[PDB]
């Protein structure tokens, strides 16, 4: 803790990092012990970034204690934090002050030219009294040669008034247009003073976010954030709220032509994008679905970044071309990462006689100030060892549920109603051009103002400047609501297919964890668009159907039977009810008419940890101990409060639990005030059984799938496979056929028989 305070205090000395009004707090979140009792702005923002340091490892030690996969947290990236933590303030520093002295200029001008066309309607009076003089004395004078040059100066007068009047009208134009500018501007002015004070705050989270939240997910880099934010706020030390990190590190220009450079538009990978374009250490990228990899090739084209392998023999070659011409290289395959970049990485150079040499295996290289250098997987479950943890920033890019809501949404939208997905297509391009069109039209106006010399009323070419700017924003402004209005029919529309796109989201990510209770259960993001490119297009359940909402009903009942299909054929049997189970459940919390049942559930799967004393047992005529143990769990529902009374009273109760089949015909033991909807009388006939008769709980179990996904539902996996269908259709030529069997079965045989019946030979 005190080499952090050390090397954060000395690296942050060049930072100003000065507050005389800062306030201790009554509380200090102090995380260095020898840490001052009075502690200044500078030791509290050093005492926080020493604690960034430390939470990294608790958090590291939350997820390893969870069986997940961490990478190890070293002082690498304690300096990669700093670095960026300076980086960011001298930026943030300097476009706050070149903003607000460009506003200070544009607000002077403005203020000059009101004091202008004030003065100039006294010299409009002035005029006009003058000439009233002039006209009242020649008229007068003809009524007694010199008397009509007294007329013709009076006309000379006329033409000057009116042209001074004319001015001060297009003046008074001129402020109005201005008018909205200077009351903008007036308010950022005015916060300007808040932004100073919440930038040390601001960076210090930002800095944080750069160098260590890379590997995780969605939900830990929130994580990481929110205690982040709560050690600043109750050490007082201001950062704004407001401002989502994607906008602060990063501007509109640079998303635009991210976006054009085929990057998702997610706010994960908006944050990925960020720390692959502000990195210390050279980035690993983690990419199961490759977009990552395309992303960075099409941005550094204009650099031709070259694409290469570890696994390569020409990998060498490849990298010393890059070291030594400087052009940017892209290795995947860092599984099988080959030491000799070692050097590379921790940029170990020796700067001699102007040549900057590194030294690459036995061989000494000058190397090029424009090298850069990405390393990639493929593999979201690769180990790393701690030396190649802490020689790259890592860049993890998985996929998050808002992201795929709108990759099915979207594809949905494209498949059922092109017209409008082209709509919608067509308003996401214009409103960007819009957005885009109106952020230079302000960068314009203000520079205008910058460079104008004198006065506005002096220059004509610049007030029709001023004008035909604001025209254009005014234009702009308008094609904006044109445009949200029709963007707004878009979504009324994407809300009768946005259910679906929740389901599609809740099934990936259900198989996603199918992993947990089995090594073998893995499916790539791919294989669901395969089972979701299918039902929307190889339906043949849509051939005639024309109803949208009739499709929609098909498409979605069909997603999950074709999902529960694919994936239980690669499964264990007695794995298929646990799939069709929570694929159930998905399918009810999709159901507008359906209570969430969320108590119900929560006993069926926790029942067993409501602790019950000695005296907790009633000991019920007719059950045995375990059985009475299960009822008194049970009775916490409000459901079941008096469910032993039930039981009790019950004649034909003890018939009933020796039956052979009790899931049949489970009797009424459960109070309700309102008839319950028949999921909902399984459910309470499901936790009944489970108390009851456990024996009989699979039996239930496929009840409910029954009661919600139908009885056919599971009545595919009781038939012989059929090889033929699914290599010929469901099978594309790269994904090979994975045969796995327990032992003593062999599928060659089957393969042999299915290659015979087509005639191909294998």
Known sequence: ????????????????????????????????????????????????????????????????????????????????????????????????????????????????????????????????????????????????????????????????????????????????????????????????????????????????????????????????????????????????????????????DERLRWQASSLPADDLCTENAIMLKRFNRYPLIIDPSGQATEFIMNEYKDRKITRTSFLDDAFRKNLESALRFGNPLLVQDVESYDPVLNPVLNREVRRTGGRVLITLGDQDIDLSPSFVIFLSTRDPTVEFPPDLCSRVTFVNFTVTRSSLQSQCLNEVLKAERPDVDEKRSDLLKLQGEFQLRLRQLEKSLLQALNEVKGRILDDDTIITTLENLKREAAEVTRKVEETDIVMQEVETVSQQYLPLSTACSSIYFTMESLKQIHFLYQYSLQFFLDIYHNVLYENPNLKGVTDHTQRLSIITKDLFQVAFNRVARGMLHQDHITFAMLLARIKLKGTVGEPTYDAEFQHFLRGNEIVLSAGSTPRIQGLTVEQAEAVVRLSCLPAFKDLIAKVQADEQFGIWLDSSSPEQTVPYLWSEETPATPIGQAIHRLLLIQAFRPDRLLAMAHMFVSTNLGESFMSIMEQPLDLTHIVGTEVKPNTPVLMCSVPGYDASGHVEDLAAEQNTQI
């Open 1 to 252: 803790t005190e080499a952090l305070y050390q090397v954060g205090k000395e690296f942050t000395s060049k930072m100003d990092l000065e507050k005389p009004n800062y306030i201790v707090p009554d509380y200090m979140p102090v995380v260095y012990d020898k840490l001052p009792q009075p502690p200044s702005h500078r030791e509290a923002i050093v005492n926080s970034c020493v604690f960034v340091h430390q939470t990294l490892h608790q958090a590291n030690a939350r997820l390893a204690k969870r069986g997940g996969r961490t990478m190890a947290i070293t002082p690498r990236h304690y300096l990669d934090f700093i670095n960026h933590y300076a980086n960011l303030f001298h930026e943030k520093r300097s476009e706050l002050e070149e903003q607000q002295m460009h506003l200070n200029v544009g607000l002077r001008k403005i203020k000059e030219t009101v004091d202008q066309v004030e003065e100039l309607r006294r010299d409009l009076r002035i005029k006009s009294q003058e000439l009233e003089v002039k006209n009242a004395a020649a008229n007068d004078k003809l009524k007694k040669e010199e008397y009509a040059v007294l007329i013709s100066e009076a006309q000379a007068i006329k033409a000057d008034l009116a042209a001074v009047e004319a001015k001060v009208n297009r003046s008074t134009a001129l402020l109005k247009s201005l008018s909205a500018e200077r009351e903008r501007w007036e308010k950022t002015s005015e916060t300007f003073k808040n932004q100073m004070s919440t930038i040390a705050g601001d960076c210090l989270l930002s800095a944080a976010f750069i160098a260590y939240a890379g590997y995780f997910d969605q939900q830990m880099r929130q994580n990481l954030f929110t205690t982040w934010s709560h050690h600043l706020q109750q050490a007082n030390i201001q950062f704004r709220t407001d401002i989502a990190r994607t906008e602060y590190l990063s501007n509109a």
